[PDB]
Design a protein around this ligand. Sequence first.
Ligand code: 3BV
Ligand code: 3BV
Ligand code: 3BV
Ligand code: CL
Ligand code: MG
Ligand code: MG
Ligand code: MG
Ligand code: MG
Lengths: 233, 204, 196, 195, 195, 125, 222, 222, 212
Amino acid sequence: TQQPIVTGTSVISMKYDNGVIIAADNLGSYGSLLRFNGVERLIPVGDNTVVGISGDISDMQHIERLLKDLVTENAYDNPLADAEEALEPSYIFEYLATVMYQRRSKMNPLWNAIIVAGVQSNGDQFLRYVNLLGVTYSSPTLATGFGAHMANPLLRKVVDRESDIPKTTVQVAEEAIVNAMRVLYYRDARSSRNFSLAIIDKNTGLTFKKNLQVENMKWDFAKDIKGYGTQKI
Amino acid sequence: SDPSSINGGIVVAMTGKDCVAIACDLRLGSQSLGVSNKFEKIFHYGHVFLGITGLATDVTTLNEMFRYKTNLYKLKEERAIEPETFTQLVSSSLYERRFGPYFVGPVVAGINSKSGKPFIAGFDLIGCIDEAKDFIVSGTASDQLFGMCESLYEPNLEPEDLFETISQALLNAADRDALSGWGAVVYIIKKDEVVKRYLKMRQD
Amino acid sequence: TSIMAVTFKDGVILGADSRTTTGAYIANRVTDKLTRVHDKIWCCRSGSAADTQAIADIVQYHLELYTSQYGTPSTETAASVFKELCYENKDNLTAGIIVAGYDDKNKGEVYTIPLGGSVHKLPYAIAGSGSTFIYGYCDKNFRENMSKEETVDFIKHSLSQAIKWDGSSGGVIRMVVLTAAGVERLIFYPDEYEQL
Amino acid sequence: MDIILGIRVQDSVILASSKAVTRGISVLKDSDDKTRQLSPHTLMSFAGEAGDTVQFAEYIQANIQLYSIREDYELSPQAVSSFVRQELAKSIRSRRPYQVNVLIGGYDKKKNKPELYQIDYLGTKVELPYGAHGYSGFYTFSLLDHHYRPDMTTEEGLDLLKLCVQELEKRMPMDFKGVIVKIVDKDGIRQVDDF
Amino acid sequence: MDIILGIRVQDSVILASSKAVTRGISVLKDSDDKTRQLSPHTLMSFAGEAGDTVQFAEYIQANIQLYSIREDYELSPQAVSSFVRQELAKSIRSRRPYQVNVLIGGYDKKKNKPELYQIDYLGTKVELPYGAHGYSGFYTFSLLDHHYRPDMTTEEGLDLLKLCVQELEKRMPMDFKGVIVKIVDKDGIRQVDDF
Amino acid sequence: GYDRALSIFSPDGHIFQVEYALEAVKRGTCAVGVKGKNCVVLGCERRSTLKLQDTRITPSKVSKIDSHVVLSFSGLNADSRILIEKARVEAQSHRLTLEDPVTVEYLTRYVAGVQQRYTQSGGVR
Amino acid sequence: TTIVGVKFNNGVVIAADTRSTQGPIVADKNCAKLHRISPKIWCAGAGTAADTEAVTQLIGSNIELHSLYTSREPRVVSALQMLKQHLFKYQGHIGAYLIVAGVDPTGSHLFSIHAHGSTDVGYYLSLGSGSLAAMAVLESHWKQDLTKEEAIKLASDAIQAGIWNDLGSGSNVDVCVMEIGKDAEYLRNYLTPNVREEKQKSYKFPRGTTAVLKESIVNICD
Amino acid sequence: QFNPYGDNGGTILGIAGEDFAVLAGDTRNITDYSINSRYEPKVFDCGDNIVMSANGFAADGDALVKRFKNSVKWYHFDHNDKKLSINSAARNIQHLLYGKRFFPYYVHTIIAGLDEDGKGAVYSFDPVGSYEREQCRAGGAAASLIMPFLDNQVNFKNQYEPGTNGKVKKPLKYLSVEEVIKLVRDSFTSATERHIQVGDGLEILIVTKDGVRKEFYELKRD
Amino acid sequence: TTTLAFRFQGGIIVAVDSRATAGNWVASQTVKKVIEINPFLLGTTAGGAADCQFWETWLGSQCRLHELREKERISVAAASKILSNLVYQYKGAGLSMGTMICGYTRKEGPTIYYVDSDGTRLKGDIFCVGSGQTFAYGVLDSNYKWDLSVEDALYLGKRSILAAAHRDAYSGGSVNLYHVTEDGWIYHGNHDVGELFWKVKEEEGSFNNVIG
Ligand SMILES: *[C@@](C)(CO)[C@](*)(O)[C@H](CC(C)C)NC(=O)[C@H](Cc1ccccc1)NC(=O)[C@H](CC(C)C)NC(=O)[C@H](CCc1ccccc1)NC(=O)CN1CCOCC1
Ligand SMILES: *[C@@](C)(CO)[C@](*)(O)[C@H](CC(C)C)NC(=O)[C@H](Cc1ccccc1)NC(=O)[C@H](CC(C)C)NC(=O)[C@H](CCc1ccccc1)NC(=O)CN1CCOCC1
Ligand SMILES: *[C@@](C)(CO)[C@](*)(O)[C@H](CC(C)C)NC(=O)[C@H](Cc1ccccc1)NC(=O)[C@H](CC(C)C)NC(=O)[C@H](CCc1ccccc1)NC(=O)CN1CCOCC1
Ligand SMILES: [Cl-]
Ligand SMILES: [Mg+2]
Ligand SMILES: [Mg+2]
Ligand SMILES: [Mg+2]
Ligand SMILES: [Mg+2]
């Protein structure tokens, strides 16, 4: 039995024609206090997988160490560690999914929602979700927390089903992700303006973008809004 | 101690071609104990029919109340109340007891004598009107009735065909609910004739 | 919420953020928490949106009826009416209100009214969830008889920090200036105040 | 208060009511009559919360007797049962409801028919050929389902009733100290002294 | 399980135990023997939580019989009662205690004296001239205080016991379906078939 | 715990520890069992090099396992007590669970099983 | 529910889905959540279904009497004030979450009311279980100086986001357009993107399938 | 306090024919009022002509299917590649479920296939391992809606022979794979209409002596 | 559930209903509540479905192991006590089981043991177990005699379940009959209440409360 202390908010993601995109803001909230601002919640594993984590940050750091250790363990007695026997996104996910469900079964969960985004060795896009309960699911778009409520609707307008994936380019897909992050900054009280974004492409590989900011915001209309009903001044 | 499921029971209403049907089971129990197999849940005021499920004392009370109100209506208005008007009266009366409500699931059914249009409606316990073209369901086996009606129903059924559909909807729903059954009654309502049929069903 | 009111040489300035929340969802990002109860008597609202609105509406009614009979009310009188409502209905209210007004005799005045319904007359006042993070800053930086431009900078810098740390505060920074000249509304957007 | 039964036969209604009054680990009385005569051809048995039962029964009795004097006329069992139901239907939404369950056995002189009504504390009325309140029903209903016939005589009804009491005395946990049996017919109300 | 009584007289110990086994609103059995013979001159009656009672009684029985075989010798009633008390004294601080109250009636062959011990589920032992467990004591103790004499015969003890059962049948709320009576004396244990 | 395998096979396929245990039995006082048409009789030798004995209190050679079964033996006297105790416990355990006293075959099978277990358990002879 | 309101050039538009739930069960697949307070003041309602209908009718009744008393067309702020004070008095127990909109002599207006009696002003608003799905669309596509046709499109798109993504919302899209100087146009079932597909089989029974015990003619006449 | 269970919604359905058996299930996965996936399969081919679904709490459902699939694998290793009969699978699943009697798998399990005589078989399980072979079973969120319809249409309950005075029952007969799929599709479209947690897509797995075939159909996405 | 079994002149009658519920939801009408442990032993099941079925199938395995080890069929007493000792170990853990172990052996004769999940074990001639046990008792007790014929005893057992199936909301479906003799148990068919009620009503003239 736990309660989460230092927490990370939404992680959002989607598939596009050649790969996957995933994003998450750089905030570590302490209740209503926006305590830590330099927190990286996207953690790359190799050059073909990115694990995005929301929820308790102490448990996130534990999971970082596990993934870091997984890379080390895989390299042991493995001449093809950087080739055929490298870590796949599906291997990394199944490992985490096993841990998450084992921990919930011992009534001592890792208080997180996790999205494993990556590209397999055969070029196939990988995007799957797992949380503190060990619940797993996959979809063309995936999001956690407020992202599930606000981002998914916007991302599903681009990729509503499987057949829309080949029709979606990396430019269009990233534009939708960046737009979603802005909407979350408008509407999520535990979000920040600063965020990180990662693209895993089957051709161009892993592109990790840090220190992005929400921009092109609409605030000007606020000056016209006065009172709560009858006020004119 | 959930008022709506102490006594048990169900009501279902359907529309057809120039006709409506309303049907109910006959069980009244006290939780597991079956007490009465003659407890009818459908009443009528003139040509307007009202079915009521839920707490049996409130079913009886509301029947007496709507008899009271429709009798005065008729004396003052010098005409029988219509289903559309009666529906509003039921809604008003239930919402009047918003914070101390009658634990019931009423269902209005009938044919407007002026326009000839078939009419059905349902309500929650605080009077929210649920109007429908096809069917209305109510009672402890409402989930079962929703499933039966949504699959069995088709529009513009003749009175004789409509009877079979509503009867099979009620019977098979009731057999999947412990607190419903013990007999059933079906009213077939045409513009100026009404037929009442008691169904044969399993008595467990 | 983050709200404040600050007296200065020419009068008084009220300041507030624009965030309204339901849990962690922002129901309104462009809220106006600075509200008129009289021509030159305004208030900053914090706590329950429903309660503070209901209260402000009643106070506005009382001061309008006061004006019809006895002429313009004092800022102290307005604060008293707020107190009377907040104190007598303390069991059923969640309202943290700052009353600010401009008389010609008394100049700029600020009264703060916390949850209990007590009244406190102060040179400046801060309130709302985000105020906790700027007690240190505001105490160190406030000076009496500041200029208009200094007071605007003081409020802007203060609420900027409150917004930065408090998740329950954000959006635009609204301000209302109360002087002998009249009533002036000011607004400041994220792109300006965030990078202060 | 615990066991009250009722059986409507061809020409009469028979009410059987337990004699025990218990409180704690003590049977305070073993000869209690859990019934009141509402009118010459209407009898009401009762069971439920201590105090409430008698207070309610006598209140109803007073009201029906008042009606009889005013109109110089006896209300029908159907009319009385409806009056009783309404009183309980009011009661259930009061500050402190009457926690009383009743059976109303009467003989309608206009119809020349016996009538048995079962009403619970919620105001739930049903006309029945046989009725019971409390845990009694869990044994007697199934028993009567089997042995009851609508054209039975009063004597056949009493034997049918003996069969119920025997079953209750065999399988009920509590000692209810036997029953007082009363018969309601065209000649009014009378008590069976040897049961 | 409910009523267990015990009376020590001049030359014997008499145990009376109710025959009813009740569950919910159903008397499942009316001929239950709530006792086990621990040894030829020692008898233990029991009452308490369902399952626990018999499980405990037979466990004690097994242990005493094991002792008898090992030593080719019968333990005294005092020795058996102390063994039983200790088992209950252990039990009360276990994860799940035995919720069982017992009476141990025995005839000490070395002393030529009858002995009655009352032990509750906590492991509270007392030697008594007469004993009871549960709500029975609230009637029988005062009754025995009045009518009991230490020099009574077995026949006088049975009449004294009949007086207790009659009082319990009059004032107890529940129907306990009579009692099985057993006598423990110099000639061993025997059951009174007509009570 | 002491784990040593004391009872083990030898090249010729014999377990010497079991066979040497038989020599201990051969040393023990004679015991005889004869069953008639309606009875069984257990006879037992007692060596007469021991005078000044107290026959009241000296352990008897025949032991009751239950009220209906008896056990006599030949060999080490101290060892026999352990088997008798186990057998008596099992006799009461059987009555408790099966609600019926042991058969003579069952009780024998149990005692024999205990003896076998000590021929292939570590740390025991 | 999903409900929205969007201001435009010469007026305001509101919209709503048409799902009514009872736990996880869809009770009404085509209920009307757009309510008429006065001819040119309309209300979209979410929350407790009876409450939204009752509170809107009561205030609509009083607004009519007020309009007759004052010999004036009713104002949105009057409906707003009367609703919020009523809801506040009941301390949130009347579970009505409303988007109030309309045109009057003062101009065009758009407000929201919550069950506890707090009101908000805005150019675009959304309430109900699918408000987050709707607000995401509104925040992404709204701009200043919308036309009539652009506002209807934005409003219905916001409702559609709720319909598809929120389990609490579904079925159709209702719309009401309130433009200055014109009659308000109520567009019942403006979109119907959730039509039931043809069933695989007819379940019309052979006549006489159901076993009957009794028949009787019922007397409805005097 | 931490709650180890969750409700992922969805509903499943098993029907058995003479020489075949179907196991259907919608592809929607949900939590509360949000959709997690429009296509997340929960009906699985487990080998030996056994199809399985464990609907309810998906994490427990996946765990169980995963464990049974593994049980089938080890059954081959330990018993000379012997085919696991449907009746033997059912009993094995009972022990899997009852093994966690005091911390249950929150799922309604259904398996389908062919018995050892080559006839269609459907088994259904409660969360703690009680099982029963049936011709017909619906499970999950919309089980209460679908099941009574199946009683009527598959087992012909409450249906009598016309003109026989309700004395002769409609005679039981096996349904064709074509007729069964019609009933499955109509069951799921009806459930989709009236249950919020049911929709998006329908995936049917058909089991004959030839093997395991799949069919997919769209469902309403609101 | 409603289950009963009574002892009489011609052996033992055992009768059960077939309903299974999850609250007010009627989950099944075709459950097998008599478990055939061997040709001479039967067990009934009331309460938690999984608990009864799992532990009574397990009981059958334990009884099979007994006759392998002892070269003799287990006694009804010993079989019932294996089950009662098992559930007693789980006492407090929340098992819900109301069962009756019925059978014949040479030493015991026809024997019935009531065993439940709180450890109670009782030998007796008549028992009714389940949510509708009281309804079954009412009919059974009022018509029971030791000298009933095999034909009359079978009917009484059937009629008693029917009575409970009718009145008890959580009982119904169909009646499963068994007759246990010195030669073993004999199955006497599945009887759907749907047809059995009306058949009994008409022929017997009972159930006058119901609209005919
Ligand atoms: C900052 C944010 C905090 O001090 C400011 O003070 C602002 C003040 C401005 C708006 C005047 N306060 C709020 O935004 C205020 C915060 C709050 C919340 C709860 C109690 C007191 C204060 N928010 C509100 O008042 C919202 C406004 C609505 C969404 C338009 N109202 C609610 O959150 C209501 C309040 C109900 C209530 C509870 C207790 C006392 C008084 C009122 N609550 C809900 O709707 C509950 N909601 C249901 C779904 O689950 C999340 C919670
Ligand atoms: C979306 C769908 C939900 O977010 C919308 O907000 C719509 C608004 C439209 C319809 C105006 N809301 C609903 O559909 C609403 C959801 C809801 C449910 C429960 C509480 C609050 C909101 N549904 C209803 O209001 C239904 C309307 C019926 C189907 C006509 N009513 C109920 O579900 C009632 C609730 C009554 C109630 C009483 C006291 C306080 C609050 C609500 N519930 C029942 O009828 C359930 N039950 C049936 C058995 O009899 C006893 C009552
Ligand atoms: C009569 C019919 C009255 O119960 C009998 O006693 C029968 C005996 C037969 C079946 C052997 N008993 C039941 O039907 C029994 C009643 C009951 C229910 C719950 C606890 C104890 C007793 N019913 C069951 O055991 C059902 C059988 C199913 C329908 C096949 N099982 C459940 O209700 C299960 C498992 C219960 C459970 C026990 C212990 C730990 C966890 C769970 N529960 C569910 O399926 C829950 N629910 C069903 C509705 O859909 C959502 C999930
Ligand atoms: Cl506000
Ligand atoms: Mg039923
Ligand atoms: Mg029944
Ligand atoms: Mg902030
Ligand atoms: Mg749906």
